[PDB]
Coordinates of all heavy atoms in Angstrom, one line a residue:
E124 N 23.3 -8.6 -16.9 CA 23.9 -9.8 -17.5 C 23.9 -11.0 -16.6 O 23.6 -12.1 -17.0 CB 25.3 -9.5 -17.9 CG 25.5 -8.7 -19.2 CD 27.0 -8.6 -19.6 OE1 27.6 -9.6 -19.8 OE2 27.5 -7.4 -19.7
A125 N 24.2 -10.7 -15.3 CA 24.3 -11.7 -14.3 C 23.0 -12.4 -14.2 O 22.9 -13.7 -14.2 CB 24.7 -11.1 -13.0
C126 N 21.9 -11.7 -14.1 CA 20.5 -12.2 -14.1 C 20.1 -12.9 -15.3 O 19.5 -14.0 -15.3 CB 19.5 -11.1 -13.8 SG 19.4 -10.4 -12.1
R127 N 20.5 -12.4 -16.5 CA 20.2 -13.0 -17.8 C 20.9 -14.3 -17.9 O 20.3 -15.3 -18.4 CB 20.7 -12.0 -18.9 CG 20.4 -12.5 -20.3 CD 20.7 -11.4 -21.3 NE 20.2 -11.8 -22.6 CZ 19.9 -11.0 -23.6 NH1 20.2 -9.7 -23.4 NH2 19.5 -11.4 -24.8
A128 N 22.1 -14.4 -17.4 CA 22.9 -15.7 -17.4 C 22.2 -16.8 -16.7 O 22.3 -18.0 -17.1 CB 24.2 -15.5 -16.8
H129 N 21.4 -16.5 -15.6 CA 20.7 -17.5 -14.9 C 19.3 -17.7 -15.3 O 18.5 -18.5 -14.8 CB 20.8 -17.2 -13.4 CG 22.1 -17.3 -12.8 ND1 22.9 -18.4 -12.9 CD2 22.9 -16.4 -12.1 CE1 24.1 -18.2 -12.3 NE2 24.1 -17.0 -11.8
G130 N 18.9 -16.9 -16.3 CA 17.5 -16.9 -16.8 C 16.5 -16.3 -15.8 O 15.3 -16.8 -15.9
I131 N 16.9 -15.4 -14.9 CA 15.9 -14.9 -14.0 C 15.8 -13.4 -14.3 O 16.7 -12.7 -14.8 CB 16.3 -15.0 -12.5 CG1 17.6 -14.3 -12.2 CG2 16.5 -16.5 -12.2 CD1 17.9 -14.3 -10.8
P132 N 14.6 -12.8 -13.9 CA 14.3 -11.4 -14.1 C 14.9 -10.5 -13.1 O 14.9 -10.8 -11.9 CB 12.7 -11.4 -14.1 CG 12.3 -12.8 -14.4 CD 13.3 -13.6 -13.6
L133 N 15.4 -9.4 -13.6 CA 16.0 -8.4 -12.6 C 14.7 -7.5 -12.5 O 14.5 -6.5 -13.3 CB 17.1 -7.6 -13.2 CG 17.7 -6.4 -12.4 CD1 18.0 -6.9 -11.0 CD2 18.8 -5.8 -13.1
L134 N 13.8 -7.9 -11.6 CA 12.5 -7.3 -11.4 C 12.6 -5.8 -11.2 O 12.4 -4.9 -12.1 CB 11.8 -7.9 -10.3 CG 10.3 -8.0 -10.5 CD1 9.9 -8.9 -11.7 CD2 9.6 -8.6 -9.3
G135 N 12.9 -5.4 -9.9 CA 13.0 -4.0 -9.6 C 14.4 -3.6 -9.1 O 15.3 -4.4 -9.2
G136 N 14.5 -2.4 -8.6 CA 15.8 -1.9 -8.2 C 15.6 -0.5 -7.5 O 14.6 0.1 -7.7
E137 N 16.6 -0.1 -6.8 CA 16.6 1.2 -6.1 C 18.0 1.8 -6.1 O 18.9 1.0 -6.2 CB 16.0 1.1 -4.7 CG 15.8 2.4 -4.0 CD 14.9 3.3 -4.8 OE1 15.3 3.9 -5.8 OE2 13.7 3.5 -4.4
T138 N 18.1 3.1 -6.1 CA 19.4 3.7 -6.0 C 19.4 4.8 -5.0 O 18.4 5.5 -4.9 CB 19.7 4.3 -7.4 OG1 19.8 3.2 -8.4 CG2 21.0 5.0 -7.4
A139 N 20.5 4.9 -4.3 CA 20.6 6.0 -3.3 C 21.9 6.7 -3.4 O 23.0 6.2 -3.7 CB 20.5 5.3 -1.9
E140 N 21.8 8.0 -3.1 CA 22.9 8.9 -3.1 C 22.9 9.6 -1.7 O 22.1 10.5 -1.5 CB 22.8 10.0 -4.2 CG 24.0 10.9 -4.3 CD 24.1 11.7 -5.6 OE1 24.5 11.0 -6.6 OE2 23.9 12.9 -5.6
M141 N 23.8 9.2 -0.9 CA 23.9 9.8 0.5 C 25.3 10.1 0.9 O 25.9 9.4 1.7 CB 23.2 8.8 1.4 CG 21.8 8.4 1.0 SD 21.0 7.5 2.3 CE 21.5 5.8 1.9
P142 N 25.9 11.2 0.4 CA 27.2 11.7 0.8 C 27.4 11.9 2.3 O 28.6 12.0 2.8 CB 27.4 13.0 0.0 CG 26.0 13.5 0.0 CD 25.2 12.3 -0.4
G143 N 26.3 11.9 3.0 CA 26.4 12.0 4.5 C 26.5 10.7 5.1 O 26.9 10.6 6.3
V144 N 26.2 9.6 4.4 CA 26.3 8.2 4.9 C 27.5 7.5 4.4 O 28.1 6.7 5.2 CB 25.0 7.5 4.4 CG1 25.2 6.0 4.7 CG2 23.8 8.0 5.2
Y145 N 27.9 7.7 3.2 CA 29.0 7.1 2.6 C 30.3 7.9 2.5 O 30.2 9.1 2.3 CB 28.7 6.6 1.2 CG 27.8 5.4 1.2 CD1 26.4 5.5 1.1 CD2 28.3 4.1 1.4 CE1 25.6 4.4 1.2 CE2 27.5 3.0 1.5 CZ 26.1 3.1 1.4 OH 25.3 2.0 1.6
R146 N 31.4 7.3 2.7 CA 32.7 8.0 2.7 C 32.9 8.2 1.2 O 32.3 7.5 0.4 CB 33.9 7.1 3.2 CG 33.8 6.8 4.7 CD 35.0 6.1 5.2 NE 35.1 6.1 6.7 CZ 35.3 7.2 7.4 NH1 35.5 8.4 6.8 NH2 35.3 7.1 8.7
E147 N 33.5 9.3 0.8 CA 33.7 9.7 -0.6 C 34.2 8.5 -1.4 O 35.2 7.8 -1.1 CB 34.7 10.9 -0.7 CG 34.1 12.2 0.0 CD 35.0 13.4 0.0 OE1 35.5 13.7 -1.1 OE2 35.2 14.0 1.1
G148 N 33.5 8.3 -2.5 CA 33.9 7.2 -3.4 C 33.4 5.9 -3.0 O 33.4 4.9 -3.8
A149 N 32.9 5.8 -1.8 CA 32.4 4.5 -1.3 C 31.0 4.2 -1.9 O 30.2 5.1 -2.1 CB 32.3 4.6 0.2
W150 N 30.8 2.9 -2.2 CA 29.6 2.4 -2.7 C 29.3 1.1 -1.9 O 30.1 0.6 -1.2 CB 29.7 2.0 -4.2 CG 29.6 3.0 -5.2 CD1 30.6 4.0 -5.5 CD2 28.6 3.2 -6.2 NE1 30.1 4.7 -6.6 CE2 28.9 4.3 -7.0 CE3 27.3 2.5 -6.4 CZ2 28.1 4.7 -8.0 CZ3 26.5 3.0 -7.4 CH2 26.9 4.1 -8.2
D151 N 28.0 0.6 -2.1 CA 27.6 -0.6 -1.5 C 26.6 -1.3 -2.5 O 25.6 -0.7 -2.8 CB 26.9 -0.4 -0.1 CG 26.6 -1.8 0.5 OD1 27.4 -2.7 0.5 OD2 25.5 -1.9 1.1
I152 N 26.9 -2.5 -2.9 CA 26.1 -3.2 -3.8 C 25.3 -4.2 -3.0 O 25.9 -5.2 -2.5 CB 27.0 -4.0 -4.8 CG1 28.1 -3.1 -5.3 CG2 26.1 -4.5 -6.0 CD1 27.7 -1.9 -6.2
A153 N 24.0 -4.0 -3.0 CA 23.1 -5.0 -2.2 C 22.0 -5.4 -3.1 O 21.7 -4.8 -4.1 CB 22.6 -4.3 -0.9
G154 N 21.3 -6.5 -2.7 CA 20.2 -7.0 -3.5 C 19.4 -8.1 -2.8 O 19.9 -8.5 -1.8
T155 N 18.3 -8.5 -3.4 CA 17.5 -9.5 -2.9 C 17.1 -10.5 -3.9 O 16.6 -10.1 -5.0 CB 16.2 -8.9 -2.3 OG1 16.5 -8.0 -1.2 CG2 15.2 -10.0 -1.7
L156 N 17.3 -11.8 -3.7 CA 16.9 -12.8 -4.6 C 15.8 -13.6 -4.0 O 15.8 -13.9 -2.8 CB 18.1 -13.8 -4.9 CG 17.7 -15.0 -5.8 CD1 17.5 -14.5 -7.2 CD2 18.9 -16.0 -5.8
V157 N 14.7 -13.9 -4.8 CA 13.6 -14.7 -4.3 C 13.7 -16.0 -5.0 O 14.1 -16.1 -6.1 CB 12.3 -13.9 -4.6 CG1 11.1 -14.8 -4.2 CG2 12.2 -12.6 -3.8
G158 N 13.3 -17.1 -4.3 CA 13.3 -18.4 -4.8 C 12.2 -19.3 -4.2 O 11.5 -18.8 -3.4
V159 N 12.2 -20.5 -4.7 CA 11.1 -21.4 -4.2 C 11.7 -22.9 -4.1 O 12.5 -23.3 -4.9 CB 9.9 -21.4 -5.1 CG1 10.3 -21.9 -6.5 CG2 8.8 -22.2 -4.5
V160 N 11.3 -23.6 -3.0 CA 11.8 -24.9 -2.8 C 10.7 -26.0 -3.1 O 9.6 -25.9 -2.6 CB 12.2 -25.1 -1.3 CG1 12.6 -26.6 -1.1 CG2 13.4 -24.2 -1.0
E161 N 11.0 -26.9 -3.9 CA 10.1 -28.0 -4.3 C 10.5 -29.2 -3.6 O 11.7 -29.4 -3.3 CB 10.2 -28.3 -5.8 CG 9.6 -27.1 -6.7 CD 10.4 -26.9 -7.9 OE1 10.7 -27.9 -8.6 OE2 10.7 -25.7 -8.2
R162 N 9.5 -30.1 -3.2 CA 9.8 -31.3 -2.5 C 10.9 -32.1 -2.9 O 11.7 -32.6 -2.1 CB 8.5 -32.2 -2.4 CG 8.6 -33.4 -1.6 CD 9.0 -33.2 -0.1 NE 9.2 -34.4 0.6 CZ 10.3 -35.2 0.5 NH1 11.3 -34.9 -0.4 NH2 10.5 -36.3 1.2
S163 N 11.1 -32.3 -4.2 CA 12.2 -33.1 -4.7 C 13.6 -32.5 -4.5 O 14.6 -33.2 -4.7 CB 12.0 -33.4 -6.2 OG 11.9 -32.2 -6.9

């Protein structure tokens, strides 16, 4: 929805389950946005 609101594609994604890395119940929301700069 967030991506849809800005009119950009949620291209890809990845998911990880690592109980040895995260404390129980702990999550981490990360991502990458690509953009472009025009002279104006």
Side-chain angles (χ1 to χ4, degrees):
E124 280 187 60
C126 283
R127 183 167 190 162
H129 294 305
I131 64 171
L133 175 55
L134 216 64
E137 186 54 285
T138 298
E140 181 164 289
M141 308 190 269
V144 168
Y145 287 94
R146 291 189 166 291
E147 294 177 53
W150 278 74
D151 184 44
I152 317 292
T155 299
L156 174 70
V157 173
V159 63
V160 177
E161 291 143 45
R162 182 58 186 72
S163 60

